[PDB]
Design a protein around this motif. Structure first.
Motif, short mmCIF file in Angstrom:
data_model
loop_
_atom_site.label_atom_id
_atom_site.label_comp_id
_atom_site.label_asym_id
_atom_site.label_seq_id
_atom_site.Cartn_x
_atom_site.Cartn_y
_atom_site.Cartn_z
N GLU A 180 0.99 -1.32 -0.09
CA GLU A 180 0.03 0.10 -0.09
C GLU A 180 0.92 0.95 -0.15
OE1 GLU A 180 -2.65 1.25 -0.37
OE2 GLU A 180 -4.16 1.36 0.63
N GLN A 181 0.63 2.51 -1.26
CA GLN A 181 1.06 3.72 -1.00
C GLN A 181 0.52 4.89 -1.07
OE1 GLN A 181 4.20 5.36 -3.80
NE2 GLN A 181 4.07 2.85 -4.17
N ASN A 182 1.18 5.82 0.26
CA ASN A 182 0.10 7.28 0.38
C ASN A 182 1.52 8.07 0.58
OD1 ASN A 182 -3.30 7.00 0.99
ND2 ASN A 182 -2.29 6.70 -1.92
N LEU A 183 1.85 8.30 -0.60
CA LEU A 183 3.61 8.89 -0.42
C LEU A 183 3.55 10.06 -0.89
CD1 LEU A 183 6.67 6.60 -0.78
CD2 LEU A 183 5.28 6.63 1.57
N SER A 184 2.42 10.51 -1.69
CA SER A 184 1.46 11.90 -2.23
C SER A 184 1.63 12.98 -1.13
CB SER A 184 0.54 11.78 -3.14
OG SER A 184 0.51 13.00 -3.78
N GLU A 185 1.34 12.74 0.20
CA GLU A 185 1.46 13.45 1.15
C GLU A 185 2.65 14.04 1.36
OE1 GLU A 185 -0.27 11.75 4.62
OE2 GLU A 185 -1.29 13.20 5.27
N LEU A 186 3.59 13.00 1.23
CA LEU A 186 4.86 13.75 2.01
C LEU A 186 5.72 14.60 1.30
CD1 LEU A 186 3.83 11.09 3.33
CD2 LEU A 186 6.58 10.23 2.71
N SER A 187 5.25 14.78 -0.14
CA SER A 187 5.75 15.87 -1.16
C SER A 187 6.41 17.15 -0.63
CB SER A 187 4.74 16.06 -2.55
OG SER A 187 5.43 15.00 -2.81
N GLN A 233 24.08 4.63 -12.10
CA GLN A 233 23.19 3.49 -12.06
C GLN A 233 22.87 4.34 -10.29
OE1 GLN A 233 23.71 0.97 -15.95
NE2 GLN A 233 23.25 0.20 -13.89
N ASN A 234 21.68 4.23 -9.89
CA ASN A 234 21.55 4.49 -8.90
C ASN A 234 20.26 3.34 -8.49
OD1 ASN A 234 22.25 7.64 -8.95
ND2 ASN A 234 23.23 6.93 -7.44
N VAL A 235 20.53 2.40 -7.19
CA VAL A 235 19.19 1.66 -6.04
C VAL A 235 18.90 1.98 -4.82
CG1 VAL A 235 18.33 -0.54 -6.21
CG2 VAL A 235 19.79 -0.11 -8.30
N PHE A 236 17.96 3.13 -4.94
CA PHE A 236 17.33 3.71 -3.62
C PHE A 236 16.29 2.84 -2.68
CE2 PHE A 236 17.09 7.76 -1.70
CZ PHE A 236 15.43 8.20 -1.43
N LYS A 237 16.49 2.18 -2.12
CA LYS A 237 15.97 2.02 -0.73
C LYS A 237 15.40 2.74 0.22
CE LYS A 237 12.88 -1.27 1.62
NZ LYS A 237 13.55 -2.45 1.65
N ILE A 238 14.00 3.02 0.66
CA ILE A 238 13.07 3.84 1.74
C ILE A 238 13.47 2.27 2.60
CG2 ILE A 238 11.57 5.39 2.59
CD1 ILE A 238 11.17 6.07 -0.37
N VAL A 239 14.52 2.87 3.81
CA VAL A 239 14.65 2.14 5.15
C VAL A 239 13.41 2.50 5.59
CG1 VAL A 239 15.99 0.98 6.74
CG2 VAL A 239 16.68 1.59 4.45
N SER A 240 13.09 3.30 6.38
CA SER A 240 12.44 4.11 7.31
C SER A 240 11.86 5.43 6.94
CB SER A 240 13.17 4.49 8.90
OG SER A 240 12.14 4.60 9.58
N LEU A 241 10.13 5.45 6.74
CA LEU A 241 9.96 6.76 6.65
C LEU A 241 8.47 7.31 7.71
CD1 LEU A 241 9.48 8.60 4.21
CD2 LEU A 241 8.02 7.17 2.76
N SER A 242 8.22 8.14 6.87
CA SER A 242 7.39 9.12 8.21
C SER A 242 7.11 10.88 7.27
CB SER A 242 6.91 9.03 9.50
OG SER A 242 8.15 10.26 10.19
N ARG A 243 5.76 11.11 8.51
CA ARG A 243 5.12 12.82 8.19
C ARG A 243 6.70 13.41 8.25
NH1 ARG A 243 0.11 13.04 7.85
NH2 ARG A 243 -0.89 11.02 8.34
N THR A 244 8.14 12.62 8.90
CA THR A 244 9.25 14.16 9.35
C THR A 244 10.27 13.77 8.96
OG1 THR A 244 8.95 12.44 11.45
CG2 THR A 244 7.61 14.96 11.23
N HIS A 245 9.88 12.33 9.12
CA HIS A 245 12.18 12.16 8.41
C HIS A 245 12.02 10.85 7.39
CE1 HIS A 245 11.90 7.41 10.33
NE2 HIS A 245 10.39 7.79 10.67
N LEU A 246 13.61 10.59 6.76
CA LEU A 246 13.22 9.56 5.77
C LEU A 246 14.90 9.37 5.66
CD1 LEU A 246 13.10 8.09 3.56
CD2 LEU A 246 13.92 10.25 1.90
N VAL A 247 14.75 7.65 5.99
CA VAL A 247 15.77 7.04 6.16
C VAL A 247 16.69 6.19 5.45
CG1 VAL A 247 17.24 4.91 7.57
CG2 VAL A 247 16.28 7.24 8.59
N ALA A 248 17.25 6.93 3.91
CA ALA A 248 17.56 6.12 2.95
C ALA A 248 18.87 5.21 2.81
CB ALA A 248 17.08 6.39 1.58
#
Ligand SMILES: O=C(c1ccccc1)c1ccccc1
Ligand SMILES: O=C(c1ccccc1)c1ccccc1
Lengths: 159, 155
Positions: free
Chosen positions: A7-14, A86-101
């Motif tokens: 499930e994904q709803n990351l638009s809000e995080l922009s 070339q980059n392969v990027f993974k979002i390990v932790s995410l929330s309305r406040t932080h992003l750990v990638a």
């Protein structure tokens, strides 16, 4: 079987985001003039196209550059993007406040670099924006005499 | 699930300017003394002071400036910066600051400014997740750059 659709709803995080820490298995890449010594400014998530646009600044050859990169999600869950290889990027932790990638980069010489990063969002609530506009209106200030410092090219240099 | 105890000194840290409004447009136009990009704010309960750390462009060059404001009995603050200033906090919380400032320059000219600032919060659990991930990848702690402190102390 395997795992099920995520499930994904990351638009809000922009919105406006900033770099806090970036680590690297190869210090050259993040040291001064390094290609990944990136000062983020904005991130825009699109759930339909399943992409993420990065808007950041990097100092190259003594000059400051504003870069725009577009990353595309994969069935894998990771994202792919072209920037200094070339980059392969993974979002390990995410929330309305932080992003750990975590990002894996392979430069033009086939060199593999693994980078970790922590970015934080600059959240501007509606309630606080209304308090500002009302106050601004009470003081008789014209909307035209208000400057936006969040989206302005004329900003200080961190280095 | 836990949250740090709320304190004024707990509000101290990295802050950024979002909007600044002025009754006198020249004061916030390029090369204007109040087109201020905030870096950090430091609140001190015991002393009744607020230390301001910001940058402003003057004569095509960015300057880092420090201003110390002192609280009055009526709760407002006074500060010396491009004349005398009476600073009033309209709304303040862990994430935002809305203030009203009255400035009178060295010529007796009065300008009234409004501003919206936001704090850049870094949670403890998020820092731990970053450091755990960094060590999982065998990255040495000296191979990590602090971008937040660079932006907070530019040049
Ligand atoms: O600046 C990063 C990046 C920049 C451009 C494209 C992909 C990634 C980055 C660094 C560390 C972790 C995650 C992402
Ligand atoms: O530049 C401001 C300021 C900076 C130092 C002292 C007093 C005021 C300011 C801007 C907007 C709202 C309130 C205060």
């Amino acid at each position: 079987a395997q795992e099920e659709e995520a499930e994904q709803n990351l638009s809000e995080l922009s919105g406006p985001w900033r770099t806090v820490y970036i680590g690297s298995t190869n210090p050259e890449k993040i040291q001064e003039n390094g290609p990944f010594r990136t000062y983020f400014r904005e991130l825009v998530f699109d759930d339909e196209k399943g992409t993420v646009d990065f808007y950041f600044s990097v100092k190259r050859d003594g000059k400051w550059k504003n870069v725009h990169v577009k990353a595309t999600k994969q069935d894998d869950g990771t994202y792919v993007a072209d920037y200094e290889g070339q980059n392969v990027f993974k979002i390990v932790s995410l929330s309305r406040t932080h992003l750990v990638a975590h990002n894996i980069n392979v430069d033009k010489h086939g060199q593999t670099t693994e980078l970790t990063e922590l970015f934080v969002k600059l959240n501007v609530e509606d309630e606080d924006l209304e308090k500002f506009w009302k106050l601004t209106e009470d003081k008789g200030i014209d909307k035209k005499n208000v400057v936006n410092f969040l989206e302005n090219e004329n900003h200080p240099h961190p280095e």
